[PDB]
Amino acid sequence: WSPKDHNLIKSVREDGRFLSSYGVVHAMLRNTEPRYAFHRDFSPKEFRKWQKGLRHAMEEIMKFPQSPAPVCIKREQREGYRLEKWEFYPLPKCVSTFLVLIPDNINKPVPAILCIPGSGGNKEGLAGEPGIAPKLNDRYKDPKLTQALNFVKEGYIAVAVDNPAAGEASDLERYTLGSNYDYDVVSRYLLELGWSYLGYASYLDMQVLNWMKTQKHIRKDRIVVSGFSLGTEPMMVLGTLDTSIYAFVYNDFLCQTQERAEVMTMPDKNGRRPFPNSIRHLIPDFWKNFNFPDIVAALAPRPIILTEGGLDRDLDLVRKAYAIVGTPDNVKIYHYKKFSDPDTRKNVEYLPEGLDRNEYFRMVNVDGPNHYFKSELVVPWLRKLLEE
């Protein structure tokens, strides 16, 4: 047998049905029209009515619950900025932590930035601090990933958070596997209880944002939420659920995740068709409501920079959302440098079926080797927005 002759999930019957359960569940997803999908032909009044529905839909699927106040457990001077480690208590029997970088001698309240790391990353990594364990240390001496350190030097106050199951929120990794965190087991408990990794991760990050609104040196109206890779997931949820968030940094390619699962069907040597990602990314009924490009579009008119491309169709979806409200230049896009020449990219309205992983990432213009927090693009953009 040969994989290439089985990558399509097409019916072998005149009636169009599937005997294989994989065939069936794939057909079901294929036929799921997300209720809050973006439509390029919206009028402003429809765009506003839709933007509200998506937000209302997002509350229902994230299931935020409706609490001692936070406490600073450490303060240490650093070069030109003081570091602060705060403890917060978001749920019963749960304590979490975050790092806050504050420039020295502040006068007026300054813009503040909530930085969220990528899979395997951690808040110390973002602040450029050594890890809580020898194995839990990040790439903390690399400027390509240290969002918080990088932003405090600019005069902003940077708050750094952990993704659940990683960093200080890890379990026994610090003794055995380190950065290879068991995000899946945590997701599984949450899922059994009707929740999700993202719902839990966003609920926690939300509480930190609420804390950021309680500081006198934090300019409450100039709060930016930045995220790298996985971190852009709670950035979207915080952004969608909180309309006062000022601007956004989406450091990851813009993915139509539902479409990715439908077309990445090429089997491997053992007949297996692995899912594009793990249950860390499983939020029941997500795809009945929307996809990432729809959500980012809904953040309009608020300023956002996407730094690592995606399929032009999706990038243009977001541009079109911004132009409808009358602020086409509030959204700023960049491709990876490898796919910057338009002859390296293709405009297709649908991604072809029967693809493998390698073929998928080339279609959406993603360059893996150079996947890192684009500080050289993000910083000058933030300067422009906040120079005034």
Added chain:
Amino acid sequence: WSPKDHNLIKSVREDGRFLSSYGVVHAMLRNTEPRYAFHRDFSPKEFRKWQKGLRHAMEEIMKFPQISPAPVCIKREQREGYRLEKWEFYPLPKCVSTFLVLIPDNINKPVPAILCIPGSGGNKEGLAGEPGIAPKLNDRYKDPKLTQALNFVKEGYIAVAVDNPAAGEASDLERYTLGSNYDYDVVSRYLLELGWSYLGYASYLDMQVLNWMKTQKHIRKDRIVVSGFSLGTEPMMVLGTLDTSIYAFVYNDFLCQTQERAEVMTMPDKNGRRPFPNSIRHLIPDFWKNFNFPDIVAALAPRPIILTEGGLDRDLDLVRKAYAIVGTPDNVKIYHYKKFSDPDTRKNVEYLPEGLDRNEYFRMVNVDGPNHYFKSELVVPWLRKLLEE
């Protein structure tokens, strides 16, 4: 480091809160009281009230679509003393599923029919004692320890055998490569994304096979039995809960309080990991907010049932009491694995100890893993007696 110094998920802080997310979610699960958990001191009035609410709760979480072409026979063959029929049915758009019907020769009057459901890595061809559709899908079809459908037809009953989603004829590319190691997980993932679950889908498909049985003149309608082995017991429970027409049940798997198992099975391995007791094919969101398997089995009362592979006595007793309350104490029949039949090998406890590994757990809940198979030597004599009022 040492795995045995970290098997207990207990807070080290005075406030009792956990930093680790695993600790936090494990605590959330530990503080989850099932809404329709059974209580040994319910009155018959409260029992009937409780039983109804549990059925309702099972409906909400299984999410059966209400909204269909009729079933059709695509094959008829003769065997010794019975014919075999393969039927197509169309439960959802773009979905066709198939089941086998074993029917004894010269049926005079309607006879009890028995819906048989296979375990992990098996199929309806194996149950009926027939070869697999391809070379690598040959279940243990020449083994009376698994051939349920073949065994019941020989006792004069008509035997309907179904597949589990992702297995056998409902499999994908496994015929070419990995055989019985069916990729259930990827199927489960899709269903979860769209708000459903593997079991809800499996139960919904299996419910239409049961509804078809209710329309056969040779199947005595009020004498239908639903038989499950290992994994197969899960949809048996859902069908028994959602349909009060079914006459009896065969639960061929140990009786598990799955929520407690997740909480207690926490000893880490060499690489610091704490595997979940089972894969995502057993993940039904909100299941544990409502009940565990023992509460669901007790709610099948007063209808006859048999449990052939034991479990922890506490749970088995819970079921005994449920049947006592309603006034039908002898309708539930229970057995233990031969190895743990002697009371001295078992322990009467109300809670399992924390920090258990997998091996330790199964011994505490009285399971003889190597002897896990369909107990025809126990169930057939149970069904001879019952089917004869």
